Amino acid sequence: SKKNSLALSLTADQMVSALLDAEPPILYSEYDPTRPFSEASMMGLLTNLADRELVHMINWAKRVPGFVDLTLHDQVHLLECAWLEILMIGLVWRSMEHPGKLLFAPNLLLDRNQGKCVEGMVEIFDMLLATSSRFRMMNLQGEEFVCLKSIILLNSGVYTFLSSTLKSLEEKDHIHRVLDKITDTLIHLMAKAGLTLQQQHQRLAQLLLILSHIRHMSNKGMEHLYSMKCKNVVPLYDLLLEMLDAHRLH
Ligand X SMILES: C[C@]12CC[C@@H]3c4ccc(O)cc4CC[C@H]3[C@@H]1CC[C@@H]2O
Using CA of residue 151, residue 153, residue 159, residue 164, what is the dihedral sign?
Answer: negative
* 216 touches its own copies by CB under 8 A: yes
SS3 call for 231: coil
Strands 110-111 and 101-102, bridge-based pairing: antiparallel
Identify the bridge partners of residue 102 per DSSP, sorted by sequence position: 110
C-beta contacts of 191-197 below 8 A and 24+ residues apart: 193/141
Of 7 and 27, CB closest to its own copies: 7
Distance CA 101, CA 115 (A): 10
Helix (H) or strand (E) holding 127: helix 121-138
* 47 touches ligand X by CB under 6 A: yes
Q: Read off the amino acid at residue 89.
A: I
Of 42 and 78, CB closest to ligand X: 42
Q: Which does 52 bind (CB under 5 to 8 A by kind): its own copies, ligand X, none?
A: none
138-197 positions binding ligand X, by CB under 6 A: none
The answer to whether 204 and 187 have CB atoms below 8 angstroms apart is: yes
* 183 touches its own copies by CB under 8 A: yes
Considering only residues 57, 87, 103, 186, which one is a binding residue for ligand X as defined by CB under 6 A?
87
Distance CA 181, CA 216 (A): 25
Select from 11-19, 30-38, 215-223, 232-240 the region that touches its own copies (CB under 8 A): 215-223
The CB-of-114 to ligand X minimum distance in angstroms stands at: 12
Q: Which does 7 bind (CB under 5 to 8 A by kind): its own copies, ligand X, none?
A: none
99, burial (CB in 10 Å: exposed 0-12, middle 13-18, buried 19+): exposed
Considering only residues 163, 172, 224, 237, which one is a binding residue for ligand X as defined by CB under 6 A?
224
Binding characters for its own copies, 139-158, by CB under 8 A (x = yes): ------------x---xx--
Binding characters for its own copies, 102-131, by CB under 8 A (x = yes): ------------------x-----xx--xx
Residues that bind ligand X (CB under 6 A): 46-47, 49-50, 53, 87-88, 90-91, 104, 124, 221, 224-225, 228
Q: Binding site residues, as ranges?
A: 53, 94, 224
